[PDB]
Write a protein that binds this ligand. Structure first.
Ligand SMILES: OC[C@H]1O[C@H](O)[C@H](O)[C@@H](O)[C@@H]1O
Ligand SMILES: OC[C@H]1O[C@H](O)[C@H](O)[C@@H](O)[C@@H]1O
Ligand SMILES: OC[C@H]1O[C@H](O)[C@H](O)[C@@H](O)[C@@H]1O
Ligand SMILES: OC[C@H]1O[C@H](O)[C@H](O)[C@@H](O)[C@@H]1O
Lengths: 388, 388, 388, 388
């Protein structure tokens, strides 16, 4: 009867989430900047396992090698003071005006080289803090008009970028993998690799595909109206779910970054059911924004709420799968047959099987109800804790 | 000053397009059935290069081996009479009630085996009529609720299906490739492999990936709000654009299948520009529905309109790329630099290049306008034939 | 601890809902036709209060005045046998090919007159069966292309139609009101009066506005990505919520008509909270389609599920509003101030109030958090029955 | 053969459009602030008729009554120097943190009174500069969660606000009308009065409805996937199109504010056709953002492009309507009958007309094609200047 999170739950938060000041395209900041050290302390008190950062969240853009050292030093002391970990790091290649047409796929070649140097310096920092995953979110790679970007050349430049980071990582002997985070649009009119599917396909063309996976975000796939649990299943099937970003989104519209559980509640349920059943072992990272209506007390309530909602859905999904009535319904709907090979007897025996065509009764087969609505109502009852 | 199509233009139409009777989820048919032989004759008069078919369009479901032979015979005589070709064929695994939970990923194993036998019989037919591409549209593979379909098991069953068709094709020595046609939803709540990206990623897990590519459709990627020209560029980059379905769509809503050029006009322009510039050599296939408001005269006007609109956009895109003013703008916007390698000097020389980081002037770089709006207005002027 | 519905709950179902045979734009029917008499009996056993009908659901199109009488007679006997009521009736002006360009706004004038006669005959039938609300869903009023429909002339023809039905109803002394049911698209490319807002605005231009209100449907407003509870609040504010259609929808896509509670679960919660708190007294009508994957047992399970899910949300919303902790949070978020007039002192005293501008501390006001995230987490806890 | 705009064309621009510095939710400004005086001069050179402003664009927030006077003085001198007019003004009730929960419908009553005082002061300024229309865009009126805002109370507070501004305007004898500008979302999760329809309906509940109309924006209705030309037709039918905001939008996504003609090109065509044919006489106002990829030269090219694209579409729509072939097609599609009353003979004669029901041939009527696809292809040919 308790939903208190603990560091064993692997809940993580970006510094930029609870640290968002509330600036949006139509208004000024409503909250003051948070000292990252303060953010690490508050989160550890909430039961969080660790934090993530962009380079620029930690070390303000343009810091001397000196102030850099200082910033890192204060941070690492806070991590030591609280026991918090840093499992993922990432680069800011979107805020500075120099990236207005992108970083790795900017039309200006000198900007692309600078984007690579800026990334490499942060990968070094990441490994030193102990991160296992390095995330790439190409928020500015894309276009508002069709002639501004040849997409085949852009994809060449993107592959070229990732191949070089792969060479760098292997040449240095680092233990760190990359994760591509897709987004369909915003802040560009259209962004390159806009969904989980496109990023997965792209990875298979890199020189060392085994170094790269995806970091899918709940709200981003939903901005394309796609089913996030299905996308995640596809990522898992491919062996490529290296990391994941949890939050909430109300439909196809601007990227809302609501706290996890807000937005589409049933998708959050089916997502939790899948992560826990596939035995996902990575961080449960929250990429969310406390609404700018909130003061700092609402910030910490919003962060706590992400963890609570995960722990409640986890208990509801486990009870659903544990319910014998549910196991019976799953058999009535033939989930068991879905898992059996269609033709383990082989092509030849299938061709010779008259019960598979010549003598197949299509009419009987047709008449068989799938019993999916009772199964779904069972899932609803479990979700709402209304199971008798 | 003429936009008359000719068979050298490679324009093709499915039998199901001009043959649509007008039945929709809320109304009865408004037009009588068209004899496929009549459809082949009318289309050849319009300047079409050939037709495509589902098995069930040609041979009514449940035909005896005898009436089958008859139907094929009348068809092939019409092809001989007109000189029309059949470059693509496909299977109907969605209309019959037996496929209500799918064909290759139906939960019932006996339905999946039947779906494979039904497909294989049509591949044989396809090769005999001379088709080079066999399209798979899994319209019923998917779900309306989350518990009804384990997506990792479904993807196993899908891969299993495609692997067996690949074994069959290679064992028979057939010259024919497969093309997966993605759709995000409808008629299922969510459909598996919902975008070009997901189908591409899936193909890399098949046993003989080189046998499979995509058949993207304009309206389907738009039902996910995605940029179709970008998706097509990604398909081309991968060497996987085996075929393409042209039509029009007004946004995220039911699959409209409007005639090509209707819908998003500028996307149609940038698509034509890309197909012609990449030297796409496949059929320009129209998958469209003449609106049920139309009688047969409007049917043939709608079909002609698809071809006309392609030929007009083709001329406008060629004039755009041929315009010296446009070539100058492309250089001002640095499309030329996009095409140059970021670091052909290699990782080490990039790390040692102080002009790439230490001494990079970010501020100057930032100040450089991309000149994309003038380039786009030039593209608009060319599209509207308002270029001075 | 029980969610059994009873006729006092006012749950109603259209004959076309549980009676849907499963025909969709890509497949044949998966279920046989249901005898309306059988549908009335099964629903009464489930605890339903009554049924609704289109004319054509009850009396097959083209029935002789004789077979008509017969059909009505069998129906009314079933109503008498079960105690079921018929609170709403409506017209089918969309299935027959003659309505392919619409009924009231068809370009052909003779089709518009026929649509009015067909409606008037059914209003007579409706009143005789005791219906209080007559619904109009103009599914075919609209267009796929811009030149096909002058929308100002179409709106003249629509107003003209509704004015004549208003004249007819008042001249006959009937006790029956009209309800306009908006839909943004499908089966037309764009449909006229596409949202609750447009229908409300239109009503204010009719000759007797007091005779007309709206019949909003959950899924239809969601096909425009709008917030249905807000739309319903606007309808209530205007005194125009005459009836309502409950179901579920997963986003902007084809009209899914899922059972109520499926789709966007939190919106269903906030909708129930609003209906019960505003004291909506009309039927709780379900306009849903049992998925064609289902046999008749799944049909009846789907129908039961709509009622169950309403009764569970009703209990969760009542517990939320009854929670003292929630009443305290509502005061912390100043819902109490929202309800107070801004300036009951009047314009002049507001102009003279220096505390309202000259001496207003904007900075203090700004700093005040709204406490909305804790309030929302409280609402989530109550919804999931995880409230301590 | 010329598309040069002139002040007689009535093209206007907000100061905030060409003045946008490029700050977006993910990046810093890419352009320096423009002096409004400079913006007025550049626009007059481009052929613009005048400018619009928010209070805060002209007079920086917190200016002394003194610096205020100064700012106004420099502006009005620029207007005198160039002959530019100021036909519309509006209030900024969204940027300052104090408006984070709204202005007129903020839960805090003291914030609502301050919002009214801030507005009234600017209406005075507006009238003095000669504006005829005062626009209200309630960008912050709305919510991210359902319990944070009782929408019936919010609508009471909104009506209360508009009623008081109406009292103020009539008490002062000012010649100025109000225009409500709808937006469905962003920056709030859901915004109140989200479409043209909802704002129109709301206006009919104000105390002096004749003082208020709508200021619809191309991109905002498109963010709900609605047809903007239809929405505008409805506004015109109601006598409520007081002003209009022109720009471009690519679908359902963040508010892009692309230059007019970009986005959905065919909708822009049908919009121009309607404005010119209904004889809309108001400003053609552009609410657009030059993309942050642009330097100031691209800013002025983007602004010129809005005007050019309007003038090209205006010529294409006029040629379409002037084409005798088009006038013939319109008769073949029975646009002429659409404009004729359905029943000017009255209810009684319609009831007695057996040719309207008893003896109506539904089958013949059904068989009649609407000829809409040829009409639309004619419209396409005219749009692309490919009309023989
Ligand atoms: O990838 C790193 C992060 O960068 C930005 O914060 C993006 O907004 C966020 O979605 C992404 O997760
Ligand atoms: O893949 C074969 C064809 O099957 C159906 O006709 C689909 O509606 C169409 O989109 C697809 O192209
Ligand atoms: O308005 C009567 C009914 O007609 C049709 O069944 C529509 O699909 C449904 O949404 C509407 O409620
Ligand atoms: O209403 C005044 C203006 O305020 C803001 O600039 C909105 O972004 C714009 O859409 C609106 O037109």
């Amino acid at each position: 009867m308790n939903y208190q999170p603990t560091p064993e739950d692997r809940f993580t938060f970006g510094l930029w989430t609870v640290g968002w000041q509330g600036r949006d395209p139509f208004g000024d900041a409503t909250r003051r900047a948070l000292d990252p050290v303060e953010s690490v302390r508050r989160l550890a008190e909430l039961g969080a396992h660790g934090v993530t950062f962009h380079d620029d969240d930690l070390i303000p853009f343009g810091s001397s090698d000196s102030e850099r050292e200082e910033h890192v030093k204060r941070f690492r002391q806070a991590l030591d003071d609280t026991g918090m970990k840093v499992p993922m790091a990432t680069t800011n290649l979107f805020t500075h005006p120099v990236f207005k047409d992108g970083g790795f796929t900017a039309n200006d070649r000198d900007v692309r080289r600078y984007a690579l140097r800026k990334t490499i310096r942060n990968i070094d920092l990441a490994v030193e803090l102990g991160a296992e995953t390095y995330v790439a979110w190409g928020g500015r790679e894309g276009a508002e008009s069709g002639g501004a970007k040849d997409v085949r050349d852009a994809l060449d430049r993107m592959k070229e970028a990732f191949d070089l980071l792969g060479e760098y990582v292997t040449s240095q002997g680092y233990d760190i993998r990359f994760a591509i985070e897709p987004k369909p649009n915003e802040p560009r009119g259209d962004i390159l690799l806009p969904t989980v599917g496109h990023a997965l396909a792209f990875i298979e063309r890199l020189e060392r595909p085994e170094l790269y996976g995806v970091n899918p975000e709940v709200g981003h796939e939903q901005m394309a109206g796609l089913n996030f649990p299905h996308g995640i299943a596809q990522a898992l099937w491919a062996g490529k779910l290296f990391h994941i970003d949890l939050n909430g989104q109300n439909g196809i519209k601007y990227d809302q970054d609501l706290r996890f559980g807000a937005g589409d509640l049933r998708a959050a349920f089916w997502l939790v059911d899948l992560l826990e059943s596939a035995g996902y072992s990575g961080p449960r990272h929250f990429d969310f924004k406390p609404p700018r209506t909130e003061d700092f007390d609402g910030v910490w309530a919003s962060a706590a709420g992400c963890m609570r909602n995960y722990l409640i859905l986890k208990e509801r999904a486990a009870a659903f799968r544990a319910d014998p009535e549910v196991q019976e319904a799953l058999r009535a709907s033939r989930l068991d047959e879905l898992a059996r090979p269609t033709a383990a007897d082989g092509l030849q025996a299938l061709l010779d099987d008259r019960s598979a065509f010549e003598e197949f009764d299509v009419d009987a087969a047709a008449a068989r109800g799938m019993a999916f609505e009772r199964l779904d109502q069972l899932a609803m009852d479990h979700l709402l804790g209304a199971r008798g």
